[PDB]
Design a protein around this ligand. Structure first.
Ligand SMILES: CCCCCCCCCCCCCCCCCC(=O)O[C@H](COC(=O)CCCCCCCCCCCCCCC)COP(=O)(O)OCC[N+](C)(C)C
Ligand SMILES: CCCCCCCCCCCCCCCCCC(=O)O[C@H](COC(=O)CCCCCCCCCCCCCCC)COP(=O)(O)OCC[N+](C)(C)C
Ligand SMILES: CCCCCCCCCCCCCCCCCC(=O)O[C@H](COC(=O)CCCCCCCCCCCCCCC)COP(=O)(O)OCC[N+](C)(C)C
Ligand SMILES: CCCCCCCCCCCCCCCCCC(=O)O[C@H](COC(=O)CCCCCCCCCCCCCCC)COP(=O)(O)OCC[N+](C)(C)C
Ligand SMILES: COc1ccc2c3c4n(c2c1)[C@@H](C=C(C)C)OOC(C)(C)C[C@@H]4N1C(=O)[C@@H]2CCCN2C(=O)[C@]1(O)[C@H]3O
Ligand SMILES: COc1ccc2c3c4n(c2c1)[C@@H](C=C(C)C)OOC(C)(C)C[C@@H]4N1C(=O)[C@@H]2CCCN2C(=O)[C@]1(O)[C@H]3O
Ligand SMILES: CC(C)CCC[C@@H](C)[C@H]1CC[C@H]2[C@@H]3CC=C4C[C@@H](O)CC[C@]4(C)[C@H]3CC[C@]12C
Ligand SMILES: CC(C)CCC[C@@H](C)[C@H]1CC[C@H]2[C@@H]3CC=C4C[C@@H](O)CC[C@]4(C)[C@H]3CC[C@]12C
Ligand SMILES: [K+]
Ligand SMILES: [K+]
Ligand SMILES: [K+]
Lengths: 435, 267
């Protein structure tokens, strides 16, 4: 009570460190001067990697129990007293805590077997975290006391989420893996460093423990987010010498962590998928699909002639399909024709995009050509391939295409599904211009 | 008076949400096992898009009444009491407020007709904003009380300016459209989030409402601009648990909003 035993919990933690370090170190030295082991190591490697279902349930089990162990901390940190004196029999949260640590103790041993280098496995962060949470829990039974100690290290489990879930094949695309990594580190650093300040501020200076800045754990969490954002209100601040000392390191380390992540946050957040989805509307009305050269003046000139007063009033919807996102001016043009013109992002050559815009039900597909092209041969070849893709999806579809040169008209006529008698038309600019 | 009815205003707002959500959801299910509608939907689409002059006057009318509705909030937020008990007959600002919400109620119905997907139209931000301002105003007649509630959401009208004015062909060049979009979002976020802090700080913690940090609305507006600029004087700060909790989300969301706009503010 009056005399605290915080050293007993702390000094026990490092006992498991150097003693465990030396036992593996000395055993290697014995073999220097003086089988199932190979099979067991290979079995342990695939067990912790989730290769098989017996290990797949194990890695997710670690995932479930990782967040769960943090829940015990949050109700423990709610108490104002950082040190408590109560027997195990009446305590509820302690009993649950015995169930977690023994599983993580045996799971730690399994990881040790799979490690090729025993010495470097001892000196990993995941090794350190169990060295500071498995021993003190057992000591709490002996000491009959409850101390917060270094219990915030359980938040370091959360950085396995991009790794554990990667073994489960849910993280396929590179964008998902990177963003999952970045988010998990930020949350874990935020939660772990908040626990350090909560312990340091409440405990006070060593050997006297008189200046105790009683602060709630969630107040500390609010304190760091103000600190990281560099706002610094000053309503909540560290007063203890130890708390300020850690805050100095946190400021330096935090920027260093941020600096290493600058190149990857730049090219990850600057993405957007604005246009997509399939064309779904009512039955009865008719629509056409326009592809090819889709620019601001290509659409505005087309829409002015298509939707004109002199033309007979017929309700035909215009659908545009281009692989590039429209600029600001083009989007405004689409808004002014919201009830008549719709846009989708995709390409004709992709059969998936053809089904989205409902090519098989459209009246005709119009292919616009880039008249001001450096290479007319290249432009014509690309446009011809679009007709092949359209005809591949459905042989009975009307296609109207602009061709820059007359000699390329022969290729279209050689298509087996091309039929001028059924509405297919070729408008050759070279033939018409010189005509 | 002693017992507050803030839940009555709040719980009524979500009543119009799930009930409205289920009615359109159940009607689709009925047709699964068991015309003027097409013409009406096409008419509604061009009405809200400003295609014709009858709809051109309507969209600008929404524009005029959008900023106007905010003026009522500013004089309501001036009062120190976030909850009031007064009859409609003597209250002036309430009577004006009845004139606005009924127009926005019928305008909301017009937007519903023009929507191709009824379910996703229910789950849009503009749908949510009316769900939190049209019901409580009608309840204030029944309850004979005045509460600020979630009234700051009317600042979310201001993000229609780059869209409504685009229908009016005043936004021609791409530079004007982009800068109008960026300015409108910043103003609306600044005004809306200031209202959240003003409501949270003045109301206090739930179920006890004892720790009430009485703060002026314009003081909160000055508080956020200091926060966004990362200056953080600390003279004005959030003390309630709920106010700090929202401030944590505002810091995270604000940088995320800023991050998405970095490539476009550069060029
Ligand atoms: C990941 C983090 C995501 C954001 C979580 C919310 C951010 C934390 C906000 C906490 C703000 C706060 O300070 O509340 C703190 C803690 O109060 C709480 O209960 C916080 C619970 C919020 C939990 C919600 C998020 C859960 C996940 C104030 O504590 P107090 O009542 O003891 O105040 C004492 C003040 N004196 C000393 C003057 C009497
Ligand atoms: C200690 C880190 C000091 C800075 C080193 C440079 C750096 O920024 O490292 C960064 C990340 O560094 C970290 O993970 C910091 C973890 C600290 C957790 C506890 C911090 C608490 C407050 C101090 C690059 O990491 P990575 O994405 O390449 O993947 C590494 C694998 N994990 C995620 C498991 C670490
Ligand atoms: C968009 C925003 C554009 C900028 C608008 C101006 C920025 C807001 C400045 C407000 C600064 C401010 O705090 O004034 C506040 C509010 O005072 C006001 O009247 C502000 C009116 C300014 C309106 C001008 C902009 C109108 C648009 C102080 O309130 P108080 O008198 O109750 O002070 C109480 C202090 N104690 C508690 C100690 C007694
Ligand atoms: C919620 C937004 C979370 C971040 C999403 C990424 C992001 O930054 O979105 C940005 C803008 O996100 C927003 O509009 C934020 C609106 C929040 C308004 C209320 C915030 C109050 C404080 C919280 C990109 O938007 P955009 O220019 O591409 O046009 C979208 C159409 N409008 C303007 C109607 C939304
Ligand atoms: C002044 O004191 C600090 C201390 C620590 C941090 C951290 C970040 N700042 C800190 C500022 C600041 C950086 C600035 C203002 C230059 O920005 O605030 C953010 C909210 C954007 C988080 C950022 N930060 C990261 O973006 C990365 C992403 C993965 C994990 N990250 C971190 O943990 C951290 O490095 C995080 O420690
Ligand atoms: C720390 O806490 C915050 C919280 C929110 C914001 C916001 C911005 N900062 C915030 C900082 C900071 C960003 C920094 C210091 C990295 O810069 O301060 C500005 C005054 C430049 C506004 C900026 N910001 C935007 O530039 C965009 C433009 C369109 C709408 N925007 C926003 O709403 C916001 O994202 C806005 O939320
Ligand atoms: C090599 C790596 C693991 C660092 C090891 C040193 C760490 C784990 C040890 C060495 C000295 C220890 C500190 C000694 C004194 C105190 C003050 C007490 O009120 C809270 C615990 C606290 C804050 C201890 C935390 C853990 C600590 C910092
Ligand atoms: C799904 C989207 C719309 C979010 C819905 C949840 C929102 C609208 C609801 C759920 C709980 C509600 C809060 C419950 C308690 C309080 C405290 C009171 O003093 C002010 C209102 C306030 C702050 C409410 C604001 C609105 C609120 C946050
Ligand atoms: K700063
Ligand atoms: K600052
Ligand atoms: K300060």
């Amino acid at each position: 009570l009056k005399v605290r035993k915080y050293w007993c919990f702390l000094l026990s933690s490092i006992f498991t460190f150097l003693a465990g370090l030396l036992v593996v170190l000395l055993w290697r030295a014995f073999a220097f001067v003086c089988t199932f082991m190979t099979e067991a190591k290979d079995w342990a490697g695939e067990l912790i990697s989730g290769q098989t279902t017996t290990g797949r349930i194990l890695v997710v089990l670690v995932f479930i129990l990782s967040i769960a162990s943090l829940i015990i901390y949050f109700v423990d940190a709610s108490s104002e007293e950082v040190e408590r004196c109560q027997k195990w029999s009446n305590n509820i949260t302690q009993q649950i805590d015995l169930a977690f640590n023994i599983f993580f103790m045996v799971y730690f041993f399994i990881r040790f077997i799979a490690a090729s280098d025993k010495l470097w496995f001892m000196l990993e962060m995941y090794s350190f975290v169990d060295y500071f949470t498995i021993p003190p829990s057992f000591v709490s039974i002996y000491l009959d006391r409850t101390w917060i100690g270094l219990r915030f290290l359980r938040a370091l489990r959360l950085m396995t989420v991009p790794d554990i879930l990667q073994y489960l094949n849910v993280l396929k695309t590179s964008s998902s893996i990177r963003l999952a990594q970045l988010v998990s580190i930020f949350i874990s650093v935020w939660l772990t460093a908040a626990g350090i300040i909560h312990l340091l501020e409440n405990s006070g200076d060593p050997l006297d423990f008189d200046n105790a800045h009683r602060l709630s754990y969630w107040t500390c969490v609010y304190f760091l987010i103000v600190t990281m954002s560099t706002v610094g209100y000053g309503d909540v601040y560290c007063e203890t010498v130890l708390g300020r000392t850690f805050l100095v390191f946190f400021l330096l380390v935090g920027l260093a962590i941020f600096a290493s992540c600058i190149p990857e946050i730049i090219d990850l957040i600057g993405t957007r998928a604005k246009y997509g989805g399939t064309l779904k509307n009512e039955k009865g009305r008719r629509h056409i699909v326009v592809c090819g050269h889709i620019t601001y003046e290509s659409v505005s000139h087309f829409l002015k002639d298509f939707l004109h007063e002199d033309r007979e009033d017929v309700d035909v919807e215009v659908v545009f399909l281009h692989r590039k996102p429209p600029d600001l001016e083009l989007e405004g043009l689409f808004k002014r024709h919201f009830t008549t013109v719709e846009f989708f992002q995709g390409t004709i050559m992709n059969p998936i995009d053809l089904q989205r815009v409902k090519v098989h039900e459209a009246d005709a597909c119009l292919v616009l050509a880039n008249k001001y092209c450096q290479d007319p041969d290249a432009e014509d070849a690309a446009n011809i391939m679009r007709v092949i893709s359209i005809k591949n999806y459905s042989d009975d579809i009307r296609v109207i295409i602009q061709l820059m040169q007359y000699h390329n008209k022969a290729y279209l006529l050689n298509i087996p599904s091309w039929d001028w008698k059924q509405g297919d038309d070729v408008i050759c600019l070279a033939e018409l211009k010189l005509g």
